[PDB]
Amino acid sequence: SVVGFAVDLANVWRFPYLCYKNGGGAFLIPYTLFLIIAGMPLFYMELALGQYNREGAATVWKICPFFKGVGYAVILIALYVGFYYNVIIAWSLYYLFSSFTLNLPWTDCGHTWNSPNCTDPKLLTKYSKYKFTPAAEFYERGVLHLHESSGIHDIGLPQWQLLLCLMVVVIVLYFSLWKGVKTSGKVVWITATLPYFVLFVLLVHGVTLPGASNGINAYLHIDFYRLKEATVWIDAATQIFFSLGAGFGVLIAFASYNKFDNNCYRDALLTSSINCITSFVSGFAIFSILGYMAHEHKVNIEDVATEGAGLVFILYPEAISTLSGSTFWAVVFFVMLLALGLDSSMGGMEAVITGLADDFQVLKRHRKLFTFGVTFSTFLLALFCITKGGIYVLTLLDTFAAGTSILFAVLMEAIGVSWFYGVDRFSNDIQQMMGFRPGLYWRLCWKFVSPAFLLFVVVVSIINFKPLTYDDYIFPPWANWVGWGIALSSMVLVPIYVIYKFLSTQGSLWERLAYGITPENEHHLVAQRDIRQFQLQHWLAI
């Protein structure tokens, strides 16, 4: 009951701006449909797969040797995403160190980082973005220094203030990873108790603000022409495969340490319900503050704030300033963000390290060296996003690191398991380790329903690709080519392993094909001609 109530950093940071970009209310229908239909069966499947085989993401594919490329690809994606989850924690630490004063920097506009185009509503061009407010100017010119960068072709040198925070973050991550595979006994009760209090207070404060009804009536309004467009569905599926965490190797790696009696069905149901409730509450709280901000600045809701990764670092500080004793609440809130980010990064590092160490057994005798290598590589690669123009690099990464790639990996996992290993064998394994057989709904969603929706989403995300933009900035085409190369770097790993394994195995075509779809512990049945996959009754099993 401590592994289901835990909140994830994605629901707090990434969901608010994806909901605001696709409008309120119209984003929740595809989100909920995808949530149920794909996420619940796939979350349950990933929980059940690791608990039975006692293996990591890469070594779990001893039931079908042709699908180890998927395990490699999910580990590569987890490495890619950890490159830019560190910059958010650095921003949170910088914001926390700025809150130890009685005059918050984001309240007035008379500092050294202020442009002469700044107006203060308290001390007082249609479809554009408004960025002359003290909070937006603070975020863009005191922590990012974006005004010395003209584009991704001119990014400049890293900022030392953010470098000093990234160095602390990586050191903490290393020293919380170098002695064991759990190292989590302390922080399991701060990550699941504090966010609920913070959102509960902020919800009441937002709904009592003036002009928040104009934002509530915009969150409860359902736009229908905003549907029948690929962007909302592609965003919803991707956000699901960030909020639940399937497609990164974390669930398989952490389920391999459970007890062989654990009920994964209850855990999946509880996690899905809590995720849905938290997402809805976060959207309501975000739109109340959006309505208040639109009211105070005499602008429109669609033009009051940006649609990037720094939406929370502008709205949440602005809602903090309207409370009583703002310094206490800012400290609490940024502590909550720091804890959430640290937990997410620790989970990703555990996933990567366990997946890579389960395959090569020499890395199990040198854990400090491997952890140091992973952390140092992450630091070196994250140095790119703390430059003067690092927001463009971070946007490109957040767009192309887990896009079509994660959907392809999740589709391949489901197809592989449910069609080659056998939905009947996968249901007899749950029968063995839980005492009850899953049921018709799960067996149908594992084999027919989820793969079809995933294939449709994958195809549509390629057919209707949109060029990258950041607010009013338009990337050059070679940036899109670079992003597509990064996306394909993980997707290409699957067909390569099927060729390598086929060429590495000796014998005729029949023997080479049989040895790669048969579990490694049943390889003695290949010389007796007893392969179940060469029969129609194996492919007609529902």
Binding residues for (R)-noradrenaline: 8, 20-21, 78, 82, 242, 307
User: 121 with 297: CB under 8 angstroms?
Assistant: yes
The span from the CA of 297 to the CA of 304, in Å, is 8
Which two structure tokens, joined as six digits, stand for 427? 């249901």
Annotated binding residues for dopamine, written as ranges, equal 8, 78, 242, 307
Q: Checking DSSP bridges between strand 469-470 and strand 473-474, what pairing results, if any?
A: antiparallel
Residue 296 CA: distances (Å) to CA of 19, 24, 85, 133: 22, 20, 33, 11
Q: Locate 367 and state its tokens.
A: 């854990």
Distance of alpha carbon 227 from alpha carbon 391, whole angstroms: 29
One-letter amino acid of 370: F
Side-chain half-sphere of 400: how many Cα atoms within 13 Å? 23
CA distances from 17 to 202, 212, 360, 419, 529 (A): 17, 18, 40, 37, 56
Contact of 302 with 74, CB cutoff 8 Å: no
Q: Using CA atoms, how far apart are residues 236 and 15, in angstroms rounded to an integer?
A: 9
C-alpha span between 512 and 535 (Å, rounded): 17
Report the alpha-carbon angle 53-354-260, nearest 5: 30
Q: Report phi then psi at 235, rounded to 5.
A: -65, -40
* Cross-strand partners of 469: 474
- As annotated, the binding site for Na(+) includes 4, 6-7, 11, 243, 275, 343-344
SS3 384: helix
| Secondary structure letter of residue 84 according to DSSP | H
Residue 120 and residue 134 in contact, taking contact as beta carbons nearer than 8 Å: yes
List 474's β-bridge partners, or say none. Answer: 469
Please give the angle made by the CA atoms of 160, 398 and 277, to the nearest 5 degrees: 110
Point out the annotated binding site. 4, 6-8, 11, 20-21, 78, 82, 242-243, 275, 307, 343-344
3-state secondary structure of 82: helix
Which of 403, 438, 456, 453 shows the shortest CA–CA distance to 44? 438
